[PDB]
């Protein structure tokens, strides 16, 4: 049987957790991930997947440093001590 | 907590209620119509004879292909059943309406169950698993119950 009796032989994973995007896409035999190619330098992104860039672009995360750059521009990238 | 079309006065009445009870709707309806209009001392005697398999509950509306029996003769029907979960939930409200007619001061010697109706509660879903990988519903049919006993005036 190709259905229910052959779904019982599925106990060996072929993808594991990626280390740079943290989702089960890192293919073990190829040794490359498939949502963003992890041993590659640049992340995998395509303009035919316009929706699949909404889930991953700039803004879906903490933005630990970039969220302050717009405030630091307004004051003008000043430095030094503050005030009275 | 409003009730059905009770055409009696509230001053000599006492009422009870159950909501979202997980009895069958189609059996608690025919239980509630077996005792409609009766005296309270004779409905309580009758409803526990049902549990001892004498004097069945006459099924009138929801009675398609149920089995025929001989205990339906006293009602003039040939199809009757003895629903046990239904009478245990109607007995639990006749005992609650006969406890509110003591706290209101009425006499339990001449009460009669005047208005009694059931309704349909929101169903409770489950799944059943059919052949060739299909999924189908498996729902409960719960029921609200309202009940009003009243002193027999003239």
């Amino acid at each position: 049987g190709k259905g229910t009796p052959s779904f019982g032989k599925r106990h060996n994973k072929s993808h594991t957790l990626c280390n740079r995007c943290g989702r089960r896409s890192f293919h073990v035999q190829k040794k490359t991930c498939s949502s963003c190619g992890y041993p590659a330098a640049k992340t995998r992104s395509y303009n035919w997947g316009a929706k699949a860039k909404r889930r991953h672009t700039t803004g879906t995360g903490r933005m630990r440093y970039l969220k302050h750059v717009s405030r630091r521009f307004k004051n003008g990238f000043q430095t030094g001590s503050a005030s009275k | 907590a409003r009730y059905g079309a009770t055409s009696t006065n509230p001053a000599k009445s006492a009422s009870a209620r159950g909501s979202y009870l997980r009895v069958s709707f189609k059996n608690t309806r025919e239980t509630a119509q077996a005792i409609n209009g009766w005296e309270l001392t004779k409905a309580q005697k009758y409803l526990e004879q049902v549990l001892d398999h004498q004097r069945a509950i006459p099924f009138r509306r929801f009675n398609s292909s149920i089995g025929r029996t001989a205990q339906g003769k006293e009602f003039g029907v040939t199809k009757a059943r003895w629903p046990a979960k239904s009478v245990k939930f109607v007995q639990g409200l006749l005992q609650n309406a006969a406890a509110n007619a003591e706290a209101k001061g009425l006499d339990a010697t001449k009460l009669y169950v005047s208005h009694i109706q059931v309704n349909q509660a929101p169903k409770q879903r489950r799944r059943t698993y059919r052949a060739h990988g299909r999924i189908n519903k498996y729902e409960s049919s719960p029921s609200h119950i309202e009940l009003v006993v009243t002193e027999k005036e003239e």
Binding site: - | P122, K123, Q124, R125, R126, R127, H132, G133, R134, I135, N136, K137
Partner: protein, 53 residues
């Protein structure tokens, strides 16, 4: 005993029981929603073999 942790921080022993019984029902209507709406397009397969003739 973490039972007193409730009793100092809002919740009472009684308020937990009537609160969880509402809460365990607030998940009951939602799972009754999920079974009802999905039950139409859940038998809708793709590659059925038709073992006849």
């Amino acid at each position: 005993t973490a039972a007193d942790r409730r009793m100092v921080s809002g919740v009472t022993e009684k308020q937990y029981k009537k609160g969880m019984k509402k809460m365990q029902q607030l998940e009951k209507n939602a799972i009754n929603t999920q079974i009802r709406r999905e039950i139409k397009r859940v038998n809708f397969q793709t590659h059925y073999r038709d073992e006849l003739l």
